[PDB]
Amino acid sequence: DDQVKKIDKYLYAMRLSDETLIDIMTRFRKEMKNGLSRDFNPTATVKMLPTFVRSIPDGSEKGDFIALDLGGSSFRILRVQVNHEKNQNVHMESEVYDTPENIVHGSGSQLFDHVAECLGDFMEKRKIKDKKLPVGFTFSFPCQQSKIDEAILITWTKRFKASGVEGADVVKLLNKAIKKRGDYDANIVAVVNDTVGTMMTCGYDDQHCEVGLIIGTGTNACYMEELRHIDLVEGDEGRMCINTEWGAFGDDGSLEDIRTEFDREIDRGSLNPGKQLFEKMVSGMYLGELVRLILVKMAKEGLLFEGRITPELLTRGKFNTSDVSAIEKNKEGLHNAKEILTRLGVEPSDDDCVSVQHVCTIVSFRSANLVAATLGAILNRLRDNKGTPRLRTTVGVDGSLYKTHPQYSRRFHKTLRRLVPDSDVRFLLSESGSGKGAAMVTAVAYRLAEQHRQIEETLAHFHLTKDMLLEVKKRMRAEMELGLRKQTHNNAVVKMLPSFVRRTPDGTENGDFLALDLGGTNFRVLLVKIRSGKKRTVEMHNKIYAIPIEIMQGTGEELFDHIVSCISDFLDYMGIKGPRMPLGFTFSFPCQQTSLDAGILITWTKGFKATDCVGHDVVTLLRDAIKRREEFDLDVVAVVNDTVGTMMTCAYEEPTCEVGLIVGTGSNACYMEEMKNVEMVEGDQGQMCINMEWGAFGDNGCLDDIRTHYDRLVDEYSLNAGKQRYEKMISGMYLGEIVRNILIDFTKKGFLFRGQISETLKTRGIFETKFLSQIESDRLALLQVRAILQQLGLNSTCDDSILVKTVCGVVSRRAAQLCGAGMAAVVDKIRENRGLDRLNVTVGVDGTLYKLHPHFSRIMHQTVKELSPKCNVSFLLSEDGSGKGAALITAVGVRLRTE
Ligand SMILES: O=P(O)(O)OC[C@H]1O[C@@H](O)C[C@@H](O)[C@@H]1O
Numbered sequence: 087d088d089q090v091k092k093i094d095k096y097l098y099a100m101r102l103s104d105e106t107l108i109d110i111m112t113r114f115r116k117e118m119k120n121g122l123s124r125d126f127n128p129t130a131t132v133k134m135l136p137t138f139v140r141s142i143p144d145g146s147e148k149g150d151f152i153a154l155d156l157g158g159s160s161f162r163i164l165r166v167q168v169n170h171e172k173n174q175n176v177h178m179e180s181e182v183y184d185t186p187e188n189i190v191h192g193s194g195s196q197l198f199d200h201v202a203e204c205l206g207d208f209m210e211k212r213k214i215k216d217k218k219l220p221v222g223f224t225f226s227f228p229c230q231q232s233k234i235d236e237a238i239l240i241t242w243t244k245r246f247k248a249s250g251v252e253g254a255d256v257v258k259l260l261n262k263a264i265k266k267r268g269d270y271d272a273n274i275v276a277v278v279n280d281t282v283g284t285m286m287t288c289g290y291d292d293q294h295c296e297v298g299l300i301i302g303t304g305t306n307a308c309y310m311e312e313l314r315h316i317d318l319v320e321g322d323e324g325r326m327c328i329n330t331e332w333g334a335f336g337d338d339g340s341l342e343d344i345r346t347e348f349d350r351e352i353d354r355g356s357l358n359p360g361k362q363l364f365e366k367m368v369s370g371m372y373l374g375e376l377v378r379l380i381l382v383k384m385a386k387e388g389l390l391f392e393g394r395i396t397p398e399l400l401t402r403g404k405f406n407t408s409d410v411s412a413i414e415k416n417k418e419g420l421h422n423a424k425e426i427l428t429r430l431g432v433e434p435s436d437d438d439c440v441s442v443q444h445v446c447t448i449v450s451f452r453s454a455n456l457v458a459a460t461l462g463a464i465l466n467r468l469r470d471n472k473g474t475p476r477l478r479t480t481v482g483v484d485g486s487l488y489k490t491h492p493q494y495s496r497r498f499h500k501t502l503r504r505l506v507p508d509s510d511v512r513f514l515l516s517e518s519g520s521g522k523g524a525a526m527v528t529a530v531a532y533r534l535a536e537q538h539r540q541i542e543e544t545l546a547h548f549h550l551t552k553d554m555l556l557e558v559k560k561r562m563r564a565e566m567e568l569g570l571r572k573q574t575h576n577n578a579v580v581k582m583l584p585s586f587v588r589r590t591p592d593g594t595e596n597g598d599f600l601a602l603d604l605g606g607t608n609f610r611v612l613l614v615k616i617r618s619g620k621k622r623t624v625e626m627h628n629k630i631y632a633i634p635i636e637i638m639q640g641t642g643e644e645l646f647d648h649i650v651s652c653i654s655d656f657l658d659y660m661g662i663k664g665p666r667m668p669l670g671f672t673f674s675f676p677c678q679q680t681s682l683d684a685g686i687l688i689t690w691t692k693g694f695k696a697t698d699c700v701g702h703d704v705v706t707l708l709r710d711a712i713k714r715r716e717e718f719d720l721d722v723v724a725v726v727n728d729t730v731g732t733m734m735t736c737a738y739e740e741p742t743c744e745v746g747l748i749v750g751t752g753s754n755a756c757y758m759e760e761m762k763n764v765e766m767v768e769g770d771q772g773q774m775c776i777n778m779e780w781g782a783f784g785d786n787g788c789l790d791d792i793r794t795h796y797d798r799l800v801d802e803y804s805l806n807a808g809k810q811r812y813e814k815m816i817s818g819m820y821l822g823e824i825v826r827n828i829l830i831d832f833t834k835k836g837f838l839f840r841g842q843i844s845e846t847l848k849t850r851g852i853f854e855t856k857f858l859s860q861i862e863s864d865r866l867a868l869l870q871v872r873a874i875l876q877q878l879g880l881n882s883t884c885d886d887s888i889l890v891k892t893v894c895g896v897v898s899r900r901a902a903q904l905c906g907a908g909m910a911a912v913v914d915k916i917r918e919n920r921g922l923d924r925l926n927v928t929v930g931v932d933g934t935l936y937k938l939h940p941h942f943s944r945i946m947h948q949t950v951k952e953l954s955p956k957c958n959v960s961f962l963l964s965e966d967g968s969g970k971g972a973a974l975i976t977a978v979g980v981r982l983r984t985e
């Protein structure tokens with residue numbers, strides 16, 4: 087008995103006490119917290135990787151798929167087919183392919199071309215090639231994942247080292263391999279660790295399974311953690327499976343007091359020197375060689391075989407984990423020991439067979455004990471999560487060692503239940519391997535992949551290519567010609583209306599002017615005092631007056647009576663009642679003008695629909711309201727479009743400015759055109775500012791090409807169906823409605839909001855410019871996005887908030903690009919007008935969508951640069967409004983009136 091009580095002291099360091107295993111467990115409990123926290127995760131050795139699997143199979147899984155399995159003892163390819171609907175119990179066929187060491191050690195090309203060739207064969211053996219079966223992929227290696235169908239290899243472990251893989255996406259790699267063959271197609275829909283595949287396989291049968299355990303070639307475990315603990319994943323709703331990759335436990339010296347001279351030597355001879363240290367004490371790829379190393383030592387010290395030693399006893403890997411298991415069998419161990427020890431050359435004595443069988447015990451007992459230490463920590467985490475005074479869960483298991491060693495399972499279960507007896511645990515053992523749990527993962531993945539595909543399909547229609555945009559640019563330019571030319575003008579949709587402003591501020595303007603700003607979001611009256619000379623100044627005041635629902639749609643007389651009434655109040659407000667003042671009237675609507683002071687309303691746009699206004703001269707209508715009140719008297723000198731007012735405002739200080747752009751409630755533009763080109767106004771000397779009214783672009787159908795189902799709905803339900811189509815794809819009054827319709831369709835399709843179309847969501851105008859701008863802000867936490875949505879009255883989840891955000895982006899982006907194509911055409915026509923090769927020009931811009939949106943102006947400028955590369959455009963934001971420009975225009979008006 088001394089021959090045994092002696093080994094017990096020699097391999098003393100490889101016998102851990104419960105006191106010890108407790109310290110280990112405590113330490114792994116910490117490693118978990120560090121792996122999960124976003125602050126320390128990058129330093130932690132236990133990666134606690136997110137798997138993107140939300141829960142064990144429930145039964146609703148259904149379909150037919152192919153599963154791959156690489157990284158374990160054998161490279162297997164399965165096929166899991168199941169429909170409960172047709173009442174078709176889970177069914178599955180599998181197979182194994184030989185993969186020579188030269189492949190597992192060659193280039194990724196070799197390895198993945200190999201896997202691709204085997205998948206080919208496997209499919210050419212059932213003729214399931216033409217079947218669009220979803221492929222699942224079990225990859226037993228640590229992987230970086232941001233989505234279930236992405237797997238960036240962090241590092242090879244166990245027996246694999248293939249060049250050109252670490253850091254790449256094995257998904258893209260396999261796809262490439264297959265592609266090169268063109269032998270068939272394959273939709274890799276998911277990738278999971280074998281721990282995860284195992285947890286899913288067992289969960290299917292045991293709805294309490296919350297853990298996955300692999301003790302085969304290598305060791306590793308996964309568990310269901312609370313999303314409120316997974317710092318590295320946006321969300322708190324529910325739970326997700328974490329792949330601990332605990333093999334790396336202690337790769338940073340953590341376990342330098344547990345590791346022995348033996349562990350260090352096997353390491354110095356291993357494939358991954360320094361890494362997977364905890365694992366190198368456990369998995370069945372090392373145990374055999376650990377024993378051999380211990381036996382070489384003892385032998386060298388004469389503790390065995392008379393101190394005899396052969397070349398075989400010194401050869402790496404002559405001792406298998408098989409032999410370790412074969413020696414530990416109850417009835418036959420010593421017999422086997424003899425045989426194995428005899429093949430080794432040494433002269434095995436019945437005593438040697440007893441010592442060796444004991445080294446195997448100490449070594450195998452330790453592996454199981456360690457996995458107990460760590461698993462005990464996982465359970466401690468679960469119980470803590472639940473809060474229950476007693477954990478009651480199930481642990482899935484798989485792996486050659488655990489499956490074949492006649493003493494391992496037995497010993498391990500006992501140690502664990504002892505370290506954490508405050509819990510009743512069941513150890514369900516996989517029998518299908520991973521196929522089942524894996525295919526159950528693929529089912530869900532594919533499901534979600536299909537929705538996603540339909541989504542991208544719909545949103546794809548909103549994507550415009552460089553060439554598409556250049557077409558839009560070209561069409562815009564053509565429509566411009568049609569509008570300017572007297573022959574085609576009457577039918578042209580882009581009216582190219584003359585403003586009668588012939589030049590930008592010349593610096594002589596001087597005086598006091600009243601002003602009106604009508605058509606934007608805020609109607610106001612202004613007082614503008616301009617002083618020219620050496621020391622030139624501008625001083626303005628204004629007041630916003632609200633316009634009531636009745637009035638805005640109502641009778642012209644009503645509307646202009648309200649306006650004049652507001653003018654009256656403002657006069658009192660400014661303490662200036664009674665002098666006859668010159669008035670500049672900014673009226674943001676298409677007007678046919680025969681002079682600066684006459685404007686006939688061509689048609690209402692945006693939200694305005696007063697009766698008996700269209701066809702009338704708005705200056706007359708105003709003069710009447712002034713007459714009718716008979717309080718004060720004004721001298722209305724000019725009517726001006728906000729575009730033109732904006733250009734003039736910005737020209738005041740920036741003489742390079744010759745273009746006006748508005749992107750607010752509506753969208754429109756203006757620019758300085760050569761009189762020789764304005765065929766609608768007699769004369770060919772100098773210039774004329776042209777109010778384009780480009781919102782009407784597309785009204786003749788020249789954009790049916792790119793308008794979508796959602797664009798048509800918005801147009802069709804608007805106050806002006808069939809009109810202002812281009813603007814309805816750009817401005818703040820409409821973008822939201824477009825988005826709203828997209829969402830209504832997605833909800834009906836079941837992609838959003840659980841498929842329930844809220845009353846709120848059926849309220850038109852819900853997505854105001856302000857909301858859109860907030861929703862698209864950068865580095866904005868989903869929690870914040872979801873908050874904004876609940877504010878509007880939309881009860882949404884993280885996934886919803888994400889989809890909504892994507893939709894808003896697609897729409898606002900398209901708007902910025904379409905707007906860019908228009909401006910691109912404009913600046914290019916100017917460049918030509920001046921016969922330049924390169925033109926520097928600046929644009930005066932105003933509008934709420936333009937000011938508030940965090941991407942619009944940017945994408946718009948970018949687009950203008952790309953489409954008109956021979957122009958360098960500068961966009962200058964107007965911060966005052968139109969008052970200055972309107973005033974500057976009114977000044978020249980007076981100089982012509984008093985002329
Ligand atoms: O074959 P081993 O590496 O010993 O054990 C681990 C393997 O178990 C197999 O039943 C399924 C594989 O997904 C897993 O990787």
Ligand SMILES: O=P(O)(O)OC[C@H]1O[C@@H](O)C[C@@H](O)[C@@H]1O
Pocket residue numbers: 603604605606607608672674728731748749750751752932933934935966967968
């Ligand atoms: O109010 P929005 O329609 O967003 O922006 C357009 C408005 O911008 C205002 O600063 C000046 C108005 O002349 C113009 O109509």
Ligand SMILES: OC[C@H]1O[C@@H](O)[C@H](O)[C@@H](O)[C@@H]1O
Pocket residue numbers: 157158225226227228243244279280281300302303304305306307331333362365
């Ligand atoms: O296959 C068993 C385990 O081996 C470990 O070395 C790998 O890092 C894990 O991905 C895997 O779960």
Ligand SMILES: OC[C@H]1O[C@@H](O)[C@H](O)[C@@H](O)[C@@H]1O
Pocket residue numbers: 605606673674675676691692727728729748750751752753754755779781810813
């Ligand atoms: O307010 C911005 C633009 O809105 C368009 O709908 C109007 O018809 C234009 O006259 C105006 O410049």
Ligand code: NA
Pocket residue numbers: 313314315316317318319320321322
């Ligand atoms: Na989280």
Ligand code: NA
Pocket residue numbers: 761762763764765766767768769770
């Ligand atoms: Na002309």
